[PDB]
Design an enzyme around this catalytic site. Structure first.
Site, PDB file in Angstrom:
ATOM      1  N   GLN A  10       0.841  -1.187   0.000  1.00 34.40           N
ATOM      2  CA  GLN A  10       0.000   0.000   0.000  1.00 34.40           C
ATOM      3  C   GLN A  10       0.871   1.230   0.000  1.00 34.40           C
ATOM      4  O   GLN A  10       0.768   2.069  -0.893  1.00 34.40           O
ATOM      5  CB  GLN A  10      -0.900   0.068   1.228  1.00 34.40           C
ATOM      6  CG  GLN A  10      -1.600   1.404   1.347  1.00 34.40           C
ATOM      7  CD  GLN A  10      -2.524   1.482   2.526  1.00 34.40           C
ATOM      8  OE1 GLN A  10      -2.078   1.532   3.675  1.00 34.40           O
ATOM      9  NE2 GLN A  10      -3.825   1.497   2.261  1.00 34.40           N
ATOM     10  N   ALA A  11       1.738   1.338   1.000  1.00 38.03           N
ATOM     11  CA  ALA A  11       2.615   2.494   1.108  1.00 38.03           C
ATOM     12  C   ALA A  11       3.373   2.768  -0.184  1.00 38.03           C
ATOM     13  O   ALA A  11       3.227   3.827  -0.780  1.00 38.03           O
ATOM     14  CB  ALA A  11       3.573   2.291   2.235  1.00 38.03           C
ATOM     15  N   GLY A 119       4.699  -5.311   1.420  1.00 39.82           N
ATOM     16  CA  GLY A 119       5.893  -4.550   1.105  1.00 39.82           C
ATOM     17  C   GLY A 119       7.227  -5.199   1.435  1.00 39.82           C
ATOM     18  O   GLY A 119       8.204  -5.073   0.697  1.00 39.82           O
ATOM     19  N   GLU A 156       6.522  -4.997  12.872  1.00 42.82           N
ATOM     20  CA  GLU A 156       7.451  -4.234  12.026  1.00 42.82           C
ATOM     21  C   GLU A 156       8.853  -4.825  11.869  1.00 42.82           C
ATOM     22  O   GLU A 156       9.239  -5.177  10.767  1.00 42.82           O
ATOM     23  CB  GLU A 156       7.538  -2.794  12.542  1.00 42.82           C
ATOM     24  CG  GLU A 156       8.594  -1.922  11.863  1.00 42.82           C
ATOM     25  CD  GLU A 156       7.992  -0.701  11.168  1.00 42.82           C
ATOM     26  OE1 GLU A 156       7.180  -0.898  10.239  1.00 42.82           O
ATOM     27  OE2 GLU A 156       8.322   0.447  11.548  1.00 42.82           O
ATOM     28  N   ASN A 179      10.301   7.528   7.555  1.00 42.18           N
ATOM     29  CA  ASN A 179       9.004   8.166   7.742  1.00 42.18           C
ATOM     30  C   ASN A 179       8.969   9.205   8.863  1.00 42.18           C
ATOM     31  O   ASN A 179       8.507  10.319   8.642  1.00 42.18           O
ATOM     32  CB  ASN A 179       7.936   7.108   7.980  1.00 42.18           C
ATOM     33  CG  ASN A 179       6.549   7.684   7.930  1.00 42.18           C
ATOM     34  OD1 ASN A 179       6.380   8.836   7.562  1.00 42.18           O
ATOM     35  ND2 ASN A 179       5.545   6.890   8.293  1.00 42.18           N
ATOM     36  N   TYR A 197      -0.215  11.736   5.287  1.00 41.60           N
ATOM     37  CA  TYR A 197       0.690  10.831   4.606  1.00 41.60           C
ATOM     38  C   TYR A 197       0.900  11.424   3.232  1.00 41.60           C
ATOM     39  O   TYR A 197       2.007  11.416   2.695  1.00 41.60           O
ATOM     40  CB  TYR A 197       0.064   9.441   4.493  1.00 41.60           C
ATOM     41  CG  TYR A 197       0.651   8.436   5.459  1.00 41.60           C
ATOM     42  CD1 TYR A 197      -0.036   7.272   5.797  1.00 41.60           C
ATOM     43  CD2 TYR A 197       1.908   8.645   6.027  1.00 41.60           C
ATOM     44  CE1 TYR A 197       0.517   6.344   6.683  1.00 41.60           C
ATOM     45  CE2 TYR A 197       2.470   7.722   6.908  1.00 41.60           C
ATOM     46  CZ  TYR A 197       1.771   6.580   7.234  1.00 41.60           C
ATOM     47  OH  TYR A 197       2.318   5.701   8.139  1.00 41.60           O
ATOM     48  N   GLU A 227      25.665   4.833 -12.769  1.00 43.58           N
ATOM     49  CA  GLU A 227      26.506   5.830 -12.107  1.00 43.58           C
ATOM     50  C   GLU A 227      26.381   5.724 -10.599  1.00 43.58           C
ATOM     51  O   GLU A 227      27.377   5.597  -9.888  1.00 43.58           O
ATOM     52  CB  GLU A 227      26.100   7.239 -12.524  1.00 43.58           C
ATOM     53  CG  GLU A 227      26.268   7.549 -13.979  1.00 43.58           C
ATOM     54  CD  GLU A 227      27.367   8.553 -14.227  1.00 43.58           C
ATOM     55  OE1 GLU A 227      27.472   9.519 -13.439  1.00 43.58           O
ATOM     56  OE2 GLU A 227      28.116   8.386 -15.218  1.00 43.58           O
TER      57      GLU A 227
HETATM   58  N1  LIG Z   1       6.089   7.899   3.680  1.00 45.78           N
HETATM   59  C1  LIG Z   1       5.085   7.075   3.764  1.00 45.78           C
HETATM   60  N2  LIG Z   1       5.123   6.044   4.608  1.00 45.78           N
HETATM   61  C2  LIG Z   1       3.987   5.275   4.574  1.00 45.78           C
HETATM   62  C3  LIG Z   1       2.847   5.472   3.787  1.00 45.78           C
HETATM   63  N3  LIG Z   1       1.905   4.501   4.029  1.00 45.78           N
HETATM   64  C4  LIG Z   1       2.448   3.743   4.943  1.00 45.78           C
HETATM   65  N4  LIG Z   1       3.708   4.147   5.313  1.00 45.78           N
HETATM   66  C5  LIG Z   1       4.585   3.512   6.312  1.00 45.78           C
HETATM   67  O1  LIG Z   1       4.859   2.172   5.875  1.00 45.78           O
HETATM   68  C6  LIG Z   1       4.524   1.235   6.930  1.00 45.78           C
HETATM   69  C7  LIG Z   1       3.156   0.670   6.716  1.00 45.78           C
HETATM   70  O2  LIG Z   1       3.081  -0.489   5.906  1.00 45.78           O
HETATM   71  P1  LIG Z   1       1.543  -1.047   5.731  1.00 45.78           P
HETATM   72  O3  LIG Z   1       0.678  -0.026   5.107  1.00 45.78           O
HETATM   73  O4  LIG Z   1       1.112  -1.531   7.074  1.00 45.78           O
HETATM   74  O5  LIG Z   1       1.714  -2.271   4.837  1.00 45.78           O
HETATM   75  P2  LIG Z   1       2.087  -2.515   3.374  1.00 45.78           P
HETATM   76  O6  LIG Z   1       3.607  -2.485   3.390  1.00 45.78           O
HETATM   77  O7  LIG Z   1       1.384  -1.636   2.450  1.00 45.78           O
HETATM   78  O8  LIG Z   1       1.686  -4.090   3.099  1.00 45.78           O
HETATM   79  P3  LIG Z   1       0.669  -5.018   4.024  1.00 45.78           P
HETATM   80  O9  LIG Z   1       1.224  -5.220   5.430  1.00 45.78           O
HETATM   81  O10 LIG Z   1       0.488  -6.445   3.491  1.00 45.78           O
HETATM   82  O11 LIG Z   1      -0.624  -4.228   4.022  1.00 45.78           O
HETATM   83  C8  LIG Z   1       4.511   2.041   8.210  1.00 45.78           C
HETATM   84  O12 LIG Z   1       5.811   2.096   8.753  1.00 45.78           O
HETATM   85  C9  LIG Z   1       4.000   3.389   7.727  1.00 45.78           C
HETATM   86  O13 LIG Z   1       4.471   4.418   8.602  1.00 45.78           O
HETATM   87  C10 LIG Z   1       2.821   6.561   2.917  1.00 45.78           C
HETATM   88  O14 LIG Z   1       1.907   6.865   2.154  1.00 45.78           O
HETATM   89  N5  LIG Z   1       4.001   7.335   2.954  1.00 45.78           N
HETATM   90 MG   LIG Z   2      -1.619  -2.639   2.447  1.00 44.30          MG
END
Ligand SMILES: Nc1nc2c(ncn2[C@@H]2O[C@H](COP(=O)(O)OP(=O)(O)OP(=O)(O)O)[C@@H](O)[C@H]2O)c(=O)[nH]1
Ligand SMILES: [Mg+2]
Ligand SMILES: CC(=O)O[C@H]1C(=O)[C@@]2(C)[C@H]([C@H](OC(=O)c3ccccc3)[C@]3(O)C[C@H](OC(=O)[C@H](O)[C@@H](NC(=O)c4ccccc4)c4ccccc4)C(C)=C1C3(C)C)[C@]1(OC(C)=O)CO[C@@H]1C[C@@H]2O
Ligand SMILES: Nc1nc2c(ncn2[C@@H]2O[C@H](COP(=O)(O)OP(=O)(O)O)[C@@H](O)[C@H]2O)c(=O)[nH]1
Ligand SMILES: [Zn+2]
Lengths: 412, 426
Positions: A10-11, A119, A156, A179, A197, A227
């Site tokens: 997602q992130a 992720g 985490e 983050n 976010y 590079e």
């Molecule tokens: N900079 C930034 N960090 C983000 C964003 N969304 C989530 N994060 C960070 O990334 C981590 C969250 O990962 P999740 O959203 O729980 O999971 P995912 O990696 O998308 O995959 P799943 O666990 O299977 O849902 C946390 O440490 C958040 O603080 C975003 O839009 N921007």
């Molecule tokens: Mg997700």
């Protein structure tokens, strides 16, 4: 010449939508123009759907948008092994279907969020399956590794000690953007306790634009992707430099904007402006790639940097005489029409490998142990096709990453 | 994704009416009507709780299990009562005796097959199943016994899909039944070994939280129920909405259960202010964490302040700063380092939806996995022994084909369950 990109998790997808936004924005290609050059992976439909429902809706092909209606699961194992597996083939197919269509590419800019399910895990094997299918390219993965104290998921570390060990032997250069340490920038260097976010994303969405976008774009001192890894990694460990931006001034509050090079470059080494809670607490830089963009006179740089090379309190590694890759682009940055980014006529997106992460990794490894020490949420992975092996044996892994980042520095 | 609610017993049933009373409005579904949804987002994910047949009739996909007609015939003869397809009503006109044994071995055991039948018709509905929601009270027949069976069967049929359990653990001060600890100890037993997420609510933890946190002077059951149903909506349904950082049953499960017991939580809602006056709007956010994390306001009976936490899940749902959220959580984790267990660097699981509770600006469901709930199973377990010792109303169980070793079993089990939970408080 090109560089595909795989936004995973997602992130990595939110950040993706962002970095992807800034793009067209500075290339005059509105909602419906050309065709991207990346893909989107997630095991939770509702999120990729946001790219299917929200803005930049028709700028993508429902083909470069992979989803697994199934379950995400904030656990590596499940995302890597068990579930995540089912999708991978299909995933790859696009990065093999999109990798073919092009003309002599250079690599895949991967976007993932270290401590997640889709992720950490998934990618782990995505980058995994890449290092074998295209060992002959660049694998720069742009990560958003675990906030030093403000993490989210309860597990985490499990998910991040696991994405590191599995990707380590597969990436070329792993960029890192913390983050939390970005929030500081939103509090201290822009002023706003209301950072959605959607902002942090605009930021990386910026620092990233300085990497690919503009660089792959003509200039007075071009810098290819290769590079990087070359001028940026001293050793095979998929070494992780840190991203930093200079004119992170507020487009409302203060206004000294006109901050000649001599200033914006000094503003990169002060620890309160580096998108990473790895304050140069001791970490000796060992290579920095100062990517400039906008109106910059090469002497201004080949001077502003000289002044730095002799500040000493900025101590560079020993075995490294000069570790300053000066990348000069033409076109100045391009700030969102009305977000909160100043909008200067020159910026410095300096990234680097710093013996500093010796910390960040440490502090993140320790975390892990505490829980593993009690198995905490272990039954969640085991029951997902993993073993006492993968954990214990990925712990030992990073262990030699705490020694590595220690040996390559602190010693002469 | 999807889920299939389960209204076991009267209570679990009575609440069904309130859980669906709510949820529907939080999804614009009128009695038999369709989606009047003030918005367009309260529809892209409904599936989780309904089914497409007509085109205006999205029917709740739950089960109504009970051995007392009058009940379901009160829920089906009132307000939203006419939205459930009759097929959903798995009644047992038998004598719904208040015996765990009468609804788990003798009377309920019959009506079971005619239930599983449907629980399969609903599971094999479509798309992909996530888990099942289970409401009931651990202080009666159709609740603890028959509902505790429904799951033991469910968890054999899909040991993959999850199982959230909403139990109305026997309130302390006064027991609304007499054998209570019998029907209870026996059902918790079944719980600790089938469902993998349980949210224990206490009719008197509610009163309190409903008579002092809502100057409400006449807290009818409807209310209590209503408050509860408010939390279970924040949990599930909610997360099946977009969000900067969204989760879903599993995340919730895979971030909240360190050890397989299944562990039970204690839900807490955010804006819990009295109507007129109080409408202080002090809901910037520090106000919600202020709320959620206080003793009172925990639907459970026990007080967190009486035992560390293992995990916490502030499932917020209303536009806010991933900074003022992610941040607050921290200070909270440091002001109370004392009770928050240490071997988990970040106990808290911040979750963040977008759209809030229909009429509100900002809310946040709290799902706490604190070691404090030790001091409840203790309670229950005590009541048992004090009466088991004399086999009090035991003839109503045995005489129903039970075992003197069955009661032994449960107590011990659930009794050990108390033990373990302490293994972390230390
Ligand atoms: N900079 C930034 N960090 C983000 C964003 N969304 C989530 N994060 C960070 O990334 C981590 C969250 O990962 P999740 O959203 O729980 O999971 P995912 O990696 O998308 O995959 P799943 O666990 O299977 O849902 C946390 O440490 C958040 O603080 C975003 O839009 N921007
Ligand atoms: Mg997700
Ligand atoms: C004019 C105005 O703003 O009125 C508010 C209101 O006064 C207050 C006091 C509401 C009110 O709630 C109660 O009084 C209450 C009664 C019994 C049990 C529990 C609560 C309200 O009735 C509740 C109602 O809640 C909702 O609309 C949510 O969407 C909520 N819905 C229901 O619970 C619901 C009620 C009846 C029928 C169908 C659904 C919800 C919450 C979580 C998840 C899903 C839905 C709201 C904001 C109000 C009123 C109408 C007065 C409060 O409660 C909630 C759950 O929001 C009580 O403290 C909060 C603060 C609110 O400001
Ligand atoms: N919150 C709540 N508790 C209820 C309701 N109805 C019964 N209870 C509780 O449930 C217990 C009694 O069990 P009961 O539901 O009658 O069992 P059953 O009907 O034989 O399965 C008592 O502790 C009551 O306080 C209700 O509508 N809401
Ligand atoms: Zn000026």
């Amino acid at each position: 010449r090109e560089c595909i990109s795989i936004h995973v998790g997602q992130a990595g997808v939110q950040i993706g939508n962002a970095c992807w936004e800034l793009y067209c924005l500075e290339h005059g290609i509105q909602p419906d123009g050309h065709v991207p050059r990346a893909v989107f992976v997630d095991l939770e439909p509702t999120v990729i759907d946001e790219v299917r429902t929200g803005t930049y809706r028709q700028l993508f092909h429902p083909e470069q948008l992979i989803t697994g209606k199934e379950d995400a699961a904030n656990n590596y194992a499940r995302g890597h092994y068990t579930i995540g597996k089912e999708i991978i083939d299909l995933v790859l197919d696009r990065i093999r279907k999109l990798a073919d269509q092009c003309t002599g590419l250079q690599g895949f800019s991967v976007f993932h969020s270290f401590g997640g399910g889709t992720g950490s895990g998934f990618t782990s094997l995505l980058m995994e399956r890449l290092s074998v299918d295209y060992g002959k390219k660049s694998k720069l993965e742009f990560s958003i590794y675990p906030a030093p104290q403000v993490s989210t998921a309860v597990v985490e570390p499990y998910n991040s000690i696991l994405t590191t060990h599995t990707t380590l032997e597969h990436s070329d250069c792993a960029f890192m953007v913390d983050n939390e340490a970005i929030y500081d920038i939103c509090r201290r260097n822009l002023d706003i306790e209301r950072p959605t976010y959607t902002n942090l994303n605009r930021l990386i969405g910026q620092i990233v634009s300085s990497i690919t976008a503009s660089l792959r774009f003509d200039g007075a001192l071009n810098v290819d992707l290769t590079e990087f890894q070359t001028n940026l990694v001293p050793y095979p460990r998929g070494h992780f430099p840190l991203a930093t931006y200079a004119p992170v001034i507020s487009a409302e509050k203060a206004y000294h904007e006109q901050l000649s090079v001599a200033e914006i470059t000094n503003a990169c080494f002060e620890p309160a402006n580096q998108m990473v809670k790895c304050d140069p607490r001791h970490g000796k830089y060992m290579a920095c790639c100062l990517l400039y963009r906008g109106d910059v006179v090469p002497k201004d740089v080949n001077a502003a940097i000289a002044t730095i090379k002799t500040k000493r309190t900025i101590q560079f590694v020993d075995w490294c005489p000069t570790g300053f890759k000066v990348g000069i682009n033409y076109e100045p940055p391009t700030v969102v029409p009305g977000g909160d980014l100043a909008k200067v006529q020159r910026a410095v997106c300096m990234l680097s490998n710093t013996t500093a992460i010796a910390e960040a990794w440490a502090r993140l490894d320790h975390k892990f142990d505490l829980m593993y020490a009690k198995r905490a949420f272990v039954h969640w992975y085991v029951g997902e096709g993993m073993e006492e092996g993968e954990f214990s044996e990925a712990r030992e892994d990073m262990a030699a990453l705490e020694k590595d980042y220690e040996e390559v520095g602190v010693d002469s | 994704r999807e889920i299939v609610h389960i209204q076991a017993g009267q209570c679990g049933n009575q609440i069904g009416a309130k859980f669906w009373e709510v949820i529907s409005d939080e999804h614009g579904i009128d009695p038999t009507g369709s989606y009047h949804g003030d918005s367009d987002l309260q529809l892209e994910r409904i599936n989780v709780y309904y089914n497409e047949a007509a085109g205006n009739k999205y029917v709740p996909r739950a089960i109504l299990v009970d051995l007392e007609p009058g009940t379901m015939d009160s829920v089906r003869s009132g307000p939203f009562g006419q939205i459930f397809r009759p097929d959903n009503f798995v009644f047992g006109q038998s004598g719904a005796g208040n015996n765990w044994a009468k609804g788990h071995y003798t009377e309920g055991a019959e009506l079971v097959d005619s239930v599983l039948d449907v629980v399969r018709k609903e599971s094999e509905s479509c798309d992909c199943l996530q888990g099942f929601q289970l409401t009931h009270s651990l202080g009666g027949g159709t609740g603890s016994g028959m509902g505790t069976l429904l799951i033991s069967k469910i968890r054999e049929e899909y040991p993959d899909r999850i199982m959230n359990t909403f139990s109305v653990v026997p309130s302390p001060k006064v027991s609304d039944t007499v054998v209570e600890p019998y029907n209870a100890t026996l059902s918790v037993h079944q719980l600790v070994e089938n469902t993998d997420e349980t949210y224990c609510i206490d009719n008197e933890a509610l009163y309190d939280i409903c008579f002092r946190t809502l100057k409400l002077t006449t807290p009818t059951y409807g209310d209590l129920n209503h408050l509860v149903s408010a939390t279970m909506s924040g949990v599930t349904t909610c997360l099946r909405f977009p969000g900067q950082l969204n989760a879903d049953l599993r995340k919730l499960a895979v971030n909240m259960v360190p050890f397989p017991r299944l562990h039970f939580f204690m839900p807490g809602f955010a804006p819990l202010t009295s109507r007129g006056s109080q409408q202080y709007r002090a809901l910037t956010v520090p106000e919600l964490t202020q709320q959620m994390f206080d003793a009172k306001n925990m639907m459970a009976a026990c007080d967190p302040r009486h035992g560390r936490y293992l995990t916490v899940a502030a499932v917020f749902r209303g536009r806010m700063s991933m900074k003022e959220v992610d941040e607050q959580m921290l200070n909270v984790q440091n002001k109370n380092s004392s009770y928050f267990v240490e071997w988990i660097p970040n106990n808290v699981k911040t979750a963040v939806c977008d759209i809030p509770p229909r009429g509100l600006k900002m809310s946040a469901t709290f799902i706490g996995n604190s070691t404090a709930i030790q001091e409840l199973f203790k309670r229950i377990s005590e009541q048992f022994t004090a009466m088991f010792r004399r086999k009090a109303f035991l003839h109503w169980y045995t005489g129903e084909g039970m075992d003197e070793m069955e009661f032994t079993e449960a107590e011990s089990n659930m009794n050990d369950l108390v033990s373990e939970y302490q293994q972390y408080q230390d």
